[PDB]
Every structure is written in structure tokens, then in C-alpha cells.
């Protein structure tokens, strides 16, 4: 809660330790506690989950699955007690009933998940400056480890969007040096569409760690999927064209970590916050 005239929001990915008991890991809990404090101090408009919402197989019963609850219970703290959530389909969520998590947005007011992929539209308290967010379904758009109209949808969308800012998120990485690494189909089908229509940046998770990349076009690459797991791998450093990596954190001994974004009249900022509370990397992107 701060009188800042900017669009703010936390962006986590890959949280949720189910199956088994409980539904959390030391780390999810840690991030839950920090994402709660971070928003008490800075304040947050919403929260977007970048994927892998219920870790091994995401949800049986459409809405009724009991895991939809232990998430509600993990992110239980008066601070987040009323903060909107915009969800995304991860790969593990596609091993379960996805339509389930979509419909779940009818049982929970804070849980928002209209379609596997959809368009969000916000506005900075400084009026004129409006932002467009395109939530996509990467499993449906790719396959590496059923949406040829999704890729065709994003085309028209991005080509028709007139907002001042345009962000795009999905679960699979375009660029990433970690364990999974760049995803061939995204690098081929999506990447060209960002610089093409001037997308400010691409947020994603999937690789259990924290990293910020940036191509020679100024399009930024925010990879913040470390809310439950932490992977120290960089097997794909070589697969990322030198100069793109600007920041990376995936140490073994560290609990979670996530990102905080603040878009204002002039620029969009991305500060990376470790579970602990320390801001370990920040950078901003032009309008
Ligand atoms: C998936 O979720 C939908 C949405 O409520 C539900 O109607 C359906 O029973 C579920 N489908 C399967 C195959 O479990
Ligand atoms: Fe994943
Ligand atoms: Fe994951």
C-alpha cells in the first residue's frame, strides 16, 4: 500500500508442492510469506501465475479438486487476502484437467482464468497510459519438453492492439539458459512476433529459477518461475545468443524468489525479489 501512480503486480511461476501432504514445500511457503509482505509495503494490483499451478498433475475435479484449496490456504495472509490473480496453464497443469482451473474462477473470486489463453487490459493511474497483457497457453502453442488459431489470434491481437504497453506471458521459455532452455517452437513462432509489433517483454516460468534476458531489439525476457523449486542448471547457456543474459539466479541453498513489476507513465520496471526479501536485481524497460 503506497500512493504510487503505477500499475503494479507480482509475477510468480511454478509453485505448489502436490501431490502428497501437504500441498506446499518449505519454499512455496517462503514465497507466499514474502509475496504477502512485498505487497503490504509496495502494494500490488494483481498477481499472475506463470504456470505449473499444482505441480505433478494439475487438478482432477473441475473446481472441486481439493488442491485448488491448499493453494488458497498457502497464499493465506490478510495482505493477499484480496489481491486478484491471473492464472496461466503450465505443462504440469496440462497433465490434469485444465478446464478445471478455468472453471475454478467461478468458485474463487480472486482466481481468474477465463480461457487457456486470453487478453487482459489495465491502465496506469495516470490515465492515457494503458497496458495490454496477453496470457497464452504454451503447451497448446508448442509441444517441446492444439492451437494454430491461438498463434493466429495473437497475430491479429498484437497487430490490432493500440495500448501504450504490451506484455506477453506463457509457461515455456523462449530464451533461457537453465535446465529446459530455449523452446524451439517459441523461438520460431513467437519470438518473431514480439519485436515485430513492439512487445515490451515476455514473462515466463518453467525453468525453476530467476533470470532476466534482453535481445538486441530491446524486447526483455523475464523468466521468474521459482516459487516452489530451485534449479542451479545452466546447461543451455550455450543455446542463448551471447549478450542476452543479464541476470540469473538459481542457487541450490536458496528458497524461492519471484518478480515485482511496476509500469508507469514513462517506463516499466522489473525488480527480482528473492524469497528472503532482498532485491537481487532490477532493470527498467522504455515505453
Ligand atoms: C474438467 O472440468 C470441467 C469443468 O467443470 C468438468 O465439467 C469436467 O467434469 C472435467 N472433465 C474431466 C474429464 O474430468
Ligand atoms: Fe514447467
Ligand atoms: Fe516447473
DSSP letter for each residue of 45-82: SEEEE-S-SSSSS--SSTTT-THHHHHHHHT-STTTTT
Q: Give distance in angstroms: CA of 197 to centre of ligand 2.
A: 27
Resolution reading in Å: 2.7
Reported residue count of the chain is 287
Locate the ligand 1 atom nearest the alpha carbon of residue 99 and give its number: 2
Of 233, 276, 275, nearest to 257 by C-alpha is 275
62 lines ligand 1 (CB under 6 A): yes
How far away, in angstroms, is 170 Cα from ligand 3 center?
Answer: 12
Q: Is 101 touching ligand 1 by the criterion CB < 6 Å? A: no
Ligand 1 contacts CB of residue 68 (under 6 A): no
Ligand nearest to the CA of 138: 2
Task: For the chain, list the domains and their CATH numbers.
Answer: 1-287 (3.60.21.10)
CB-based contact 185:150 (threshold 8 Å): no
Residue-wise over 62-87: b if at least 16 C-beta within 10 A, else e?
Answer: bbebebbebbeebbeeebbeebebbb
Residue owning the nearest CA to atom 12 of ligand 1:
97
d(CA 273, CA 287): 23
**Residue 99 near ligand 1, beta carbon < 6 Å:** yes
Amino acid at each position: 500500500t503506497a500512493p504510487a501512480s503505477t500499475l503494479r503486480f507480482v509475477a510468480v511461476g511454478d509453485w505448489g508442492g502436490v501431490p502428497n501432504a501437504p500441498f506446499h514445500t518449505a519454499r512455496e511457503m517462503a514465497n507466499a510469506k514474502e509475496i504477502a509482505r512485498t505487497v503490504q509495503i509496495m502494494g500490488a494490483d494483481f498477481i499472475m501465475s506463470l504456470g505449473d499451478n499444482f505441480y505433478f498433475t494439475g487438478v482432477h475435479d473441475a473446481n472441486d479438486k481439493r488442491f485448488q484449496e491448499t493453494f488458497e490456504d498457502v497464499f493465506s495472509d490478510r495482505a493477499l487476502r484480496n489481491i486478484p490473480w491471473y492464472v496461466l496453464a503450465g505443462n504440469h497443469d496440462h497433465l490434469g484437467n485444465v478446464s478445471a482451473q478455468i472453471a475454478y474462477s467461478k468458485i474463487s473470486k480472486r482466481w481468474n482464468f477465463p480461457s487457456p489463453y486470453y487478453r487482459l487490459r489495465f491502465k496506469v493511474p495516470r490515465s492515457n497510459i494503458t497496458v495490454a497483457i496477453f496470457m497464452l497457453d504454451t503447451v497448446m502453442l508448442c509441444g517441446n519438453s492444439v492451437a494454430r488459431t491461438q498463434l493466429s489470434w495473437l497475430k491479429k491481437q498484437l497487430a490490432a492492439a493500440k495500448e501504450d504497453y504490451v506484455l506477453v506471458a506463457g509457461h515455456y521459455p523462449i530464451w533461457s539458459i537453465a535446465e529446459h532452455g530455449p523452446t524451439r517452437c517459441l523461438v520460431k513462432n513467437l519470438r518473431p512476433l514480439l519485436a515485430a509489433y513492439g512487445v515490451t517483454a515476455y514473462l515466463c516460468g518453467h525453468d525453476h529459477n530467476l533470470q532476466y534476458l534482453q535481445d538486441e531489439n530491446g524486447v526483455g525476457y523475464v523468466l521468474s518461475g521459482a516459487g516452489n523449486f530451485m534449479d542451479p542448471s545452466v546447461r543451455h547457456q550455450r543455446k542463448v545468443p551471447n549478450g542476452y543474459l543479464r541476470f540469473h539466479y538459481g542457487s541450490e541453498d536458496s528458497l524461492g524468489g519471484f518478480t515485482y513489476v511496476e509500469i508507469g507513465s514513462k517506463e516499466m520496471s522489473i525488480t527480482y525479489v528473492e524469497a528472503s526479501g532482498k532485491s537481487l536485481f532490477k532493470t527498467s524497460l522504455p515505453r
